[PDB]
Write a protein that binds this DNA or RNA. Structure first.
Lengths: 160, 97, 69, 74, 57, 55, 126
RNA sequence: CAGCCACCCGAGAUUGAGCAAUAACAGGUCUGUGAUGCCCUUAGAUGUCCGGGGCUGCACGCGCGCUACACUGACUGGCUCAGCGUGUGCCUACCUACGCCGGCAGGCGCGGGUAACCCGUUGAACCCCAUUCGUGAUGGGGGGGGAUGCAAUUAUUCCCAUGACGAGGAAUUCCCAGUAAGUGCGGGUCAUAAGCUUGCGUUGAUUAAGUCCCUGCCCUUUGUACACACCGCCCGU
RNA sequence: AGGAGUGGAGCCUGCGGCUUAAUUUGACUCAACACGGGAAACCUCACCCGGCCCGGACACGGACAGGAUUGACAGAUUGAUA
């Protein structure tokens, strides 16, 4: 019954990697902001939070039950051993994905990428972030793939 | 798509009795992990999966060696029509709201 | 001093099984020359040795200048 | 590599071709001085096969798949 | 535990083996006490991130 | 018979089929600790588990 | 002149009496019928060697016995058959003799002439 | 003045790595990935199903991989020392005490433990040599079989044999105090190590406290008809 | 200044034309060679066969539903094992 620590830590890393890749694959449309997982005695749980609280919670509970069944049936989880908790937002120290999604789904419906860059820059520095960088790699004007990197604010790279 | 239909109706029946189901894609396996002690050829069921996802009734998804279903109102209704399930069955995943 | 058969020098050699310690020039090296059969049946080792190709994996793709100038 | 020009040997194989009557006449045998169908072929005790499988008498070898007894006419 | 990871998939550039550390820290406590007191002390909605296991050998 | 018609060949040293499961590739797999993840995602989920660099 | 015999035992001596004496001294390459397990494909192979050495008329070259995934040879009884191994383009022709025992019958399969001792690559002055 | 050297002190009067600019390379990765420049992609085959011949085939032909290369040492053992590498896994199955047949494994219950519990005080490496080799290519590296997996094969992975090299092709190789090398312990395939590699010990050092020479990068001044920027520009037959 | 001072001698998966279909590249002189953290018959070949399934849903043509991969046994038989 007894298990070591390193091996189950790596197994939890596997589970975390798969859940997060699946999450970033699907849930990018509905405005999720911060997602985590937590542990209770013989019980695992996944928690999500966003500005669109009930929207991420979903309609008819389809997302909740569907993805919980997915993880339950894939990761050897015994039935019922996954649930969703609740939380709330403290402040705006993690405000990137809201404007990122805004620009993304403006561009998907028809919008210039650099207009979105202007907007996201100005909203991010109105929010109070110190500095922001957006690197769009590919073709923007012509068939030369220039990695258009837009910086603003300060960026340190050296130190603990 | 060349699996005898008895396994097809069995898989559909267990699908609707359980809801969604999982899929592992590999030809080298002798017997299915969850469907063990039955000796079901995996290639045929894989073709059935890609056919039903190409037929346009469950949103086709290729997710990194491990496949799941995409359940919706339209998908459930189509499965009900295709398996001719009685007009009294409700999936166990929607219990107690 | 009772040297065992598997310990013996010509242990279970080809043609005939002899356990006597006899050493004479003229025919002993011919007994060591059991290569007659292997080269005659043109086995894998024999079909290598027809041209003089290595049979122990020594990587001599273009090296081997010792004695080959 | 280049395309092998796969017509010199076996360009493509076609499906199995057989000649079958719309209503089976070869599987059932008549002429046994009976007003109804008479089963002259001896039934095999192996029930693992299907009910519609008709036991045949072949001159050489056996083609069943699971049991394949050995017998002859002599 | 040390783990070391090459980064350039194809050989192109330096041999920058990412050296990552997994340093696990362990504390033991053996107790001769009534069960209720230590159960109340311990089962107090423990902090996440620290793993506790009770053993009877 | 049936054992030669189909599936007369196993692979008991299989690494390709029993490769890193969470993504769709074989390389970047080390069999310690049950990794089943490439080095690129090994780093992408390193600090999340608790990995730190000091050397 | 003098013929060569393996431990003083010739083809008739290896053929008539079974390997009750070679039970411990049987070679590698699937000796493990006692330690790992027993495998198939020596039954239709036995039937086909019976067929090949039963209907064969004397004074002509016997039937080409074709092998793509080369079979295992377990006894020199099959000596007397023209074996065609799959080198990829033609028949690797082998006429088996009692001197083949203890080998893999695919070992006489080569699919390339030795590299021509001609010219090197274009840029050989480095 | 910033500072620098020596000395007295102190465990330490500079220990190593970690994080590591703005901007760019028309670099690698779609072979980490079903979003992405694509004529055969109308499911005609690279694997699904087979694994034969070989990157083990030969000529300067680019590749640290070459242990060892002999009286400093090769033999046999009297011998005396931390790896602080780590070694029992939800669809995991690969880490011989107590007795013996043996050159290895092979085992019959059987590798003590999910670990500082069980491997353990992990007796592995230059050593008072425990017969021999007092100056020479020699004692100095040195073709059949008994058995992990479906198959030892150009011995992949144990038993007897038929023992170039001279400090070594002209050789864009690292290194300044526990450091170069030797040697040893392990981890990456794990069906049992890795000829490399990654960590760690042991033995352990001679010159240095300097300088632009011959190598690269950088700065200042200067010239330019160059700006795709000298792999430039350009003139004439 | 100095130690290995390499390569000099048989001494990695990769490795240049590389005769055969093949012992090739996806990296090309501080940006190709311990390269995709390969103990190479394979997943420890991409260049090789053929049996192994022929991915076609979406308007509709064919008897205007039975055109059988999935069933092995001494002659057929590009392995009798399809």
């Amino acid at each position: 019954v007894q298990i070591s620590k390193k091996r189950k830590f790596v197994a939890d890393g596997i589970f975390k990697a798969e859940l997060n890749e699946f999450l970033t694959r699907e849930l990018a449309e509905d405005g999720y902001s911060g997602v985590e997982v937590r542990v209770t005695p013989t019980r695992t749980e996944i928690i999500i939070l966003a500005t669109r609280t009930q929207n991420v919670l979903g309609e008819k509970g389809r997302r909740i039950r569907e993805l919980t069944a997915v993880v339950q049936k894939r990761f050897g989880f015994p039935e019922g051993s996954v649930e969703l908790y609740a939380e709330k937002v403290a402040t705006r120290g993690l405000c990137a994905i809201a404007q990122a999604e805004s620009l993304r789904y403006k561009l998907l419906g028809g919008l210039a990428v650099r207009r979105a860059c202007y907007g996201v820059l100005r909203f991010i520095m109105e929010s109070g972030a110190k500095g922001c960088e957006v690197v769009v790699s590919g073709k923007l004007r012509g068939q030369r793939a220039k990695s258009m990197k837009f910086v603003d604010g300060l960026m340190i790279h050296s130190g603990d | 798509m060349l699996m005898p239909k008895k396994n097809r109706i069995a898989i559909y029946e267990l699908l609707f009795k359980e809801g969604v189901m999982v899929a592992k894609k590999d030809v080298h396996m002798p017997k299915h992990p969850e469907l063990a002690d039955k000796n079901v050829p995996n290639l045929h069921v894989m073709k059935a999966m890609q056919s039903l996802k190409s037929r346009g009734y469950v949103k086709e998804q290729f997710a990194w060696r491990h496949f799941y279903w995409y359940l919706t109102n339209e998908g459930i209704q189509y499965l009900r029509d295709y398996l001719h399930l009685p007009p009294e069955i409700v999936p166990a995943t929607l219990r107690r709201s | 001093y009772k040297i065992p058969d598997w310990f013996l020098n010509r242990q279970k050699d080809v043609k005939d099984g002899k356990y006597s310690q006899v050493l004479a020039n003229g025919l002993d090296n011919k007994l060591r020359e059991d290569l007659e059969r292997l080269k005659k049946i043109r086995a894998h080792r024999g079909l290598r040795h027809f041209w003089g190709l290595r049979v122990r994996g020594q990587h001599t793709k273009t090296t081997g200048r010792r004695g080959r100038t | 590599k280049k395309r092998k020009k796969k017509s010199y040997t076996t360009p493509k194989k076609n499906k199995h071709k057989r000649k079958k009557v719309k209503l089976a006449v070869l599987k059932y045998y008549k002429v046994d001085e009976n007003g109804k169908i008479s089963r002259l072929r001896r039934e095999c005790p192996s029930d693992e096969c299907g009910a519609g499988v008709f036991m045949a008498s072949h001159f050489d070898r056996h083609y069943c798949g699971k049991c394949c007894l050995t017998y002859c006419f002599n | 535990l040390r783990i070391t990871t090459r980064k350039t998939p194809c050989g192109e550039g330096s041999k920058t083996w990412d050296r990552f550390q997994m340093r696990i820290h362990k504390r033991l406590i053996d107790l001769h006490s009534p069960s209720e007191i230590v159960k109340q002390i311990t089962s107090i909605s423990i902090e996440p991130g620290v793993e506790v296991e009770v053993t009877i050998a | 018979g049936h054992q030669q018609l189909y599936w007369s060949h196993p692979r008991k040293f299989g690494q390709g089929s029993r490769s890193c499961r969470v993504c769709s590739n074989r390389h970047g797999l080390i069999r310690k600790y049950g990794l089943n993840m490439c080095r690129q995602c090994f780093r992408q989920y390193a600090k999340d588990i608790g990995f730190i660099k000091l050397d | 002149f003098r013929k060569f015999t393996y431990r003083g035992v010739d083809l008739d001596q290896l053929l008539d009496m079974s390997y009750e004496q070679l039970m411990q001294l049987y070679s590698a390459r699937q000796r493990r019928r006692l330690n790992r397990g027993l495998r198939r494909k020596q039954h239709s192979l036995l039937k086909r060697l019976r067929k090949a050495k039963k209907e064969a008329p004397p004074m002509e070259k016997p039937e080409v016995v074709k092998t793509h995934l080369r079979d295992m040879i377990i006894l020199p009884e099959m000596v007397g058959s023209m074996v065609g191994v799959y080198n990829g383009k033609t028949f690797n022709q082998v006429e088996i003799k009692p001197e083949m025992i203890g080998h893999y019958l695919g070992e006489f399969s080569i699919t390339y002439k030795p590299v021509k001792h001609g010219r090197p690559g274009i840029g050989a002055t480095h």
